[PDB]
Amino acid sequence: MKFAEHLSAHITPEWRKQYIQYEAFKDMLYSAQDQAPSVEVTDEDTVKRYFAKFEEKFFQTCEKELAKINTFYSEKLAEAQRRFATLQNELQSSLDAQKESHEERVQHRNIKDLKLAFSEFYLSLILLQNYQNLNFTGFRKILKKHDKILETSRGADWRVAHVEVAPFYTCKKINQLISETEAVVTNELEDGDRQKAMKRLRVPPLGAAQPAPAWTTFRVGLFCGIFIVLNITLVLAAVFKLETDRSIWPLIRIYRGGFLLIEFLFLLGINTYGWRQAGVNHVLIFELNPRSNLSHQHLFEIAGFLGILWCLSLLACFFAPISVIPTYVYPLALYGFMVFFLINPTKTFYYKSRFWLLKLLFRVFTAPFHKVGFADFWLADQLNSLSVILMDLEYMICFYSLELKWDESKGLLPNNSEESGICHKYTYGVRAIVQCIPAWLRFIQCLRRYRDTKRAFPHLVNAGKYSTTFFMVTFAALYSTHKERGHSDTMVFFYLWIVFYIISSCYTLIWDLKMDWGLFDKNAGENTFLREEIVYPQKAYYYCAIIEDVILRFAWTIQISITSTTLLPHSGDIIATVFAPLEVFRRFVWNFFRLENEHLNNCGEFRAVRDISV
Amino acid sequence: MKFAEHLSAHITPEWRKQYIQYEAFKDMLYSAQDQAPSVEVTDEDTVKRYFAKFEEKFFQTCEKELAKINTFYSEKLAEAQRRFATLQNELQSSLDAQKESHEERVQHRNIKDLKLAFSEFYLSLILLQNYQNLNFTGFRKILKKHDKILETSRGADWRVAHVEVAPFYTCKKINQLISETEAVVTNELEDGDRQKAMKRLRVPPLGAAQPAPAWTTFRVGLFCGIFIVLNITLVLAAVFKLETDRSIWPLIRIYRGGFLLIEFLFLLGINTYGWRQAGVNHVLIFELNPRSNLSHQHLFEIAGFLGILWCLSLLACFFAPISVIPTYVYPLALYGFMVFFLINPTKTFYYKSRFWLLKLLFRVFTAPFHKVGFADFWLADQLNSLSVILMDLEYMICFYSLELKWDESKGLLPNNSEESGICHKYTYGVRAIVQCIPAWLRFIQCLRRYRDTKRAFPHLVNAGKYSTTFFMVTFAALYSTHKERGHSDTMVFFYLWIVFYIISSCYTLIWDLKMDWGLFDKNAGENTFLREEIVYPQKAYYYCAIIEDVILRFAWTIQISITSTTLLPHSGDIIATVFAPLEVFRRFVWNFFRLENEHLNNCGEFRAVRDISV
Numbered sequence A, B: 001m002k003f004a005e006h007l008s009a010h011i012t013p014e015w016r017k018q019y020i021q022y023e024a025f026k027d028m029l030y031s032a033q034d035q036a037p038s039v040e041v042t043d044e045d046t047v048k049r050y051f052a053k054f055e056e057k058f059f060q061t062c063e064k065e066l067a068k069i070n071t072f073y074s075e076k077l078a079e080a081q082r083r084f085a086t087l088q089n090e091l092q093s094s095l096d097a098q099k100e101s102h103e104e105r106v107q108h109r110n111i112k113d114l115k116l117a118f119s120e121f122y123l124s125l126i127l128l129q130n131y132q133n134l135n136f137t138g139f140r141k142i143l144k145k146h147d148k149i150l151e152t153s154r155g156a157d158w159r160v161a162h163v164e165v166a167p168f169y170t171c172k173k174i175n176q177l178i179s180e181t182e183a184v185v186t187n188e189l190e191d192g193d194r195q196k197a198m199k200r201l202r203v204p205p206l207g208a209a210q211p212a213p214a215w216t217t218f219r220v221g222l223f224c225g226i227f228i229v230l231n232i233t234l235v236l237a238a239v240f241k242l243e244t245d246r247s248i249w250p251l252i253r254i255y256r257g258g259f260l261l262i263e264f265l266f267l268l269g270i271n272t273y274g275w276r277q278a279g280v281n282h283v284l285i286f287e288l289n290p291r292s293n294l295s296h297q298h299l300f301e302i303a304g305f306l307g308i309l310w311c312l313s314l315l316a317c318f319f320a321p322i323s324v325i326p327t328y329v330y331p332l333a334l335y336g337f338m339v340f341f342l343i344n345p346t347k348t349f350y351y352k353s354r355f356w357l358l359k360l361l362f363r364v365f366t367a368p369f370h371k372v373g374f375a376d377f378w379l380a381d382q383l384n385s386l387s388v389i390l391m392d393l394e395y396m397i398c399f400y401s402l403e404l405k406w407d408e409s410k411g412l413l414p415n416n417s418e419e420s421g422i423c424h425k426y427t428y429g430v431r432a433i434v435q436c437i438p439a440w441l442r443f444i445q446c447l448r449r450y451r452d453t454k455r456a457f458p459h460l461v462n463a464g465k466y467s468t469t470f471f472m473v474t475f476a477a478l479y480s481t482h483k484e485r486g487h488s489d490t491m492v493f494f495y496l497w498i499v500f501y502i503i504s505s506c507y508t509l510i511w512d513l514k515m516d517w518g519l520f521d522k523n524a525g526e527n528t529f530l531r532e533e534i535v536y537p538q539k540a541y542y543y544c545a546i547i548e549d550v551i552l553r554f555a556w557t558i559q560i561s562i563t564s565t566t567l568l569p570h571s572g573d574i575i576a577t578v579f580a581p582l583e584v585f586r587r588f589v590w591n592f593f594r595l596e597n598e599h600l601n602n603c604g605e606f607r608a609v610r611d612i613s614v
């Protein structure tokens, strides 16, 4: 009925330019129909010749499209045949080695990677088959549509004479390859059982708009509604009922991290939805499973549940829920519940994503030794902007270990004490390393990448980009320490520090535009100050992001400076609280164009599957 | 991949017994496969003869199923051809009358009914086409499964030799009929335009019933979450913050009706979901549009919004956030909003259902004159159990017009002695008629039906059933009035009243079982105390409903009698509040089996479309 959006939603992204231009043909046909003058205005010969010339040009365009499709199909078939030959040779070598302990574990890894390579090959073959079917359907539908407006029946004859003889339609090699692959997998690997072998080779409609189950959407809406109502109740309770008898700073300073985490989860769900809709293949970049994947609804549901728990804990800290449990227990219960949810060793509640995240975290935090992929440095980049949660963790540990006297009530709020503040300082040393941890991780990753791929431009400069944070933080700490000690030269520690402000931002900002986002290209074309090809439909997004990155970069250096050095102590807490939720927004904007620039490097290579070895 | 639930969900409910028994064939094949004796000593000849006899019986069953399908298709095709001939003759008569004002309005009505009859005929033809396609697919799939499991080449040969030469597959008369119908509608009726005619004749995937849009489910969940959180907050506020000013009785008596309406909407949504899932075709019975329909999610989304408004109004009444607006304004705003939502004359917010409901309400309340259909008496039956809202309406009108002072913001709470008691007495006697209105409507509908049909068994006994409410209410009112007047003979007005209690319930209860639900049949099989065929899978539902109706009938009788007679001082206002939400539950249970018994009168007639006339 509606072929346009069906074709749009069933297109393989990396081959989007290799399909048929249905919409262009439709617009051309409509323009030709409208351009016809009146019967009386022009003679019948002029109308006849106009129709004839338009038909000729239409058929020339159709011939060009058919030739392009045929060439693409032939190249893909040749590539598939060569890959099959290579895989069969490797499988034969592995099986003859197996026929003739550490050797057993090596073999286990061998048939661990081989059964994945075969699955990837099967996915490629299925994608080629779908491409062929969809292209033929589009040709037939556009010719049928043409054969109605013009009322000249020349499209049916053209289809019968040209498309029906096309090799892209008359060849059966893909089906034979599929059958041989199934036979090889069932015989050599799974040893005679078609059930599990077919189960691991099933291709669900991954290249479509497969809706989520209605229960997931219902849960998302339920959690969102409870969250907004609890938020309104919390705001009213804070405004009306509570009096800040002994400050609420050790309360917001503890509850900031959970709010930041929930906001990050929500924005990540939005990011995933945008990637999926815009046509960016993040599954190939992140090296995920094409058949099993997490949609944005699951992330929204997780964020909603976490927000429900956070709001309930804050409300419990607010009024007087239980008259026997001390009020300094609720944040502990909340964070313990978060940790328990993450590291649950059972097989429930997205058990297939939590383990992947845990292994990724281990690899990230063991940076110098493990090899570096896209996911590792992407997660390290996220942790770079998510350091406020680490700061809150350190502050909460030092507040509970030393400052709060557990024997009274109202443990959390009243910090009424003599030396209240021994934790709101920096002089013992541990306030700068906690903030320099992620920069150190990225610096070490860049060093390892340069060592492996010994090409010193991208990585040594990238490694030097993260080193400016060390200089800035150490100079801020030194200036604050000498100000507290009242040295007459403290002001000089101000001066150079200020330049290490600018040298920081102007560094990273440039790397954000030229290298991370790939803008300001010399082949910009019509798109001014951008690159030649853009995925997202509107340039206003690009211009607004360019505008906002500049502003949000400058108020990242100032937040990390004011917060580690802990200076100007009358508005530092409020400014840090205000500026914390802007860092996540900046990173959320950055992710879009970072992954879009990464994706466009796989569109000139026509790569659609994750190539693997044994 | 999974043909079982596809076949189950794509079956026309009224032709379910005329399809192919796929599950029975699967179970038979599995049992035969499991019953393989043994190679051990049994001997190959015994296994061979067992396989041969099973193959023979399998082929006999397949032949019987094929013959049944062929005969059903032949009968349906003959019926369709005769109906087409009749419709063509009527259309020809109408067009020749049109070719050769009140006559113009009559012609407009004629082409109003004709364009509906043609659409229903087109729906029937499309249903027959789908039946043919699905039956062939099922045959092919089951034969392929048999061939796979029993390692032979008999199934393919049998399919080629028998199913291929079947008329249910080689007869293309339906396609010619469909093309002729399109031609006739496009030429004679829509005058040469295929666009609007085809749009009118399009058959959407009803069987698929594509899982409802995600925004609707999201809104349902959002409204539900807000409702539950507001309910918890309201309960806490009522328990804790309330004040012993003067009574909360003129508040529950006002807010009861909205709660009852919301509960009715929720239970009606559950009812619609149950009807759709169980296979009951309520669209045919209610004479709705087979292409445009309301799902249960829309009713849940209306109910959630109404509950949100109700909870907000109650919270505003409790807290009184605004210090200038009087407290007796909020229920007025709530009920005005409900009325405005119902009678909105624009074209938004389910405008094609509200107008249908309004016309139905007009027909119901003008009962003696209009003809009676299923939708009229069904709605009157619902209003019979929904009289508490009418009682609340009359009480609120009397309370505001007479009692309320409006001068000082004492509001909807209190502060009088006898002003509470003129509205709580029955000197006017108006609270008997407000309760006897729906019984009167049903009684007059039964009288009109008996006059139309001239068959006196069902309708002149139904009218007698409905007439007992008048006796019960009038005797309760007389007893209460004489008790207030202190007559020495008032006790006798008690005595006979008590029998008019029993005579009421034992009447209606019997009509609920034998006639409304069609149970206690004389020719039941293994379903003891039930009817021969049942739609809902489990008999436990039937037995539970049989148990429940008995208790709830006496509860309903005593509740309405006590509420009408205004007797038994304080208890007769908490007992009514407790018993009010049980009469909606009783009606909600009654609807299931009422419509199921109605449905099992077209399944034996093989009627799947609604017949009309011009």
Ligand SMILES: O=P(O)(O)O[C@H]1[C@@H](OP(=O)(O)O)[C@H](OP(=O)(O)O)[C@@H](OP(=O)(O)OP(=O)(O)O)[C@H](OP(=O)(O)O)[C@H]1OP(=O)(O)O
Pocket (backbone or CB within 6 Å): A001, A002, A003, A004, A141, A145, B194, B195, B198, B199
């Ligand atoms: O005039 P248009 O441009 O609006 O065409 C309409 C419609 O014409 P209409 O006005 O009489 O209803 C066609 O119906 P026909 O009369 O040709 O049969 C319909 O084809 P269809 O029913 O599937 O028939 P088959 O393809 O299965 O053979 C086509 O659907 P697509 O080609 O599949 O996208 C639509 O295209 P669209 O613009 O995308 O909605």
Ligand SMILES: O=P(O)(O)O[C@H]1[C@@H](OP(=O)(O)O)[C@H](OP(=O)(O)O)[C@@H](OP(=O)(O)OP(=O)(O)O)[C@H](OP(=O)(O)O)[C@H]1OP(=O)(O)O
Pocket (backbone or CB within 6 Å): A111, A112, A115, A347
């Ligand atoms: O070799 P291993 O140690 O990796 O484990 C086997 C397999 O064990 P098995 O031999 O008893 O069938 C695991 O199934 P289980 O024992 O947990 O049921 C399965 O885990 P899984 O499906 O993810 O998890 P679950 O859905 O089953 O809970 C894993 O698949 P991957 O981890 O996805 O690659 C398999 O790898 P492979 O040898 O390539 O088939």
Ligand SMILES: O=P(O)(O)O[C@H]1[C@@H](OP(=O)(O)O)[C@H](OP(=O)(O)O)[C@@H](OP(=O)(O)OP(=O)(O)O)[C@H](OP(=O)(O)O)[C@H]1OP(=O)(O)O
Pocket (backbone or CB within 6 Å): A194, A195, A198, A199, B001, B002, B003, B004, B141, B145, B148
């Ligand atoms: O052994 P079973 O009883 O489980 O059969 C399975 C499956 O066998 P498997 O174990 O090798 O995967 C069949 O695959 P095959 O090897 O015959 O091709 C499959 O057919 P399929 O792929 O659609 O093939 P085509 O019909 O399109 O030609 C069939 O689907 P349905 O007939 O359409 O319902 C399934 O039936 P089910 O029980 O309902 O899930």
Ligand SMILES: O=P(O)(O)O[C@H]1[C@@H](OP(=O)(O)O)[C@H](OP(=O)(O)O)[C@@H](OP(=O)(O)OP(=O)(O)O)[C@H](OP(=O)(O)O)[C@H]1OP(=O)(O)O
Pocket (backbone or CB within 6 Å): B112, B115, B347
């Ligand atoms: O004859 P009438 O007075 O009953 O009205 C015509 C038509 O008016 P038209 O002649 O200008 O096209 C109405 O469309 P509008 O004027 O409101 O746009 C349409 O209402 P509708 O589609 O429900 O409502 P909307 O979706 O359009 O808002 C109605 O269809 P039905 O009531 O469903 O039977 C039609 O009946 P028919 O003659 O059989 O085609």
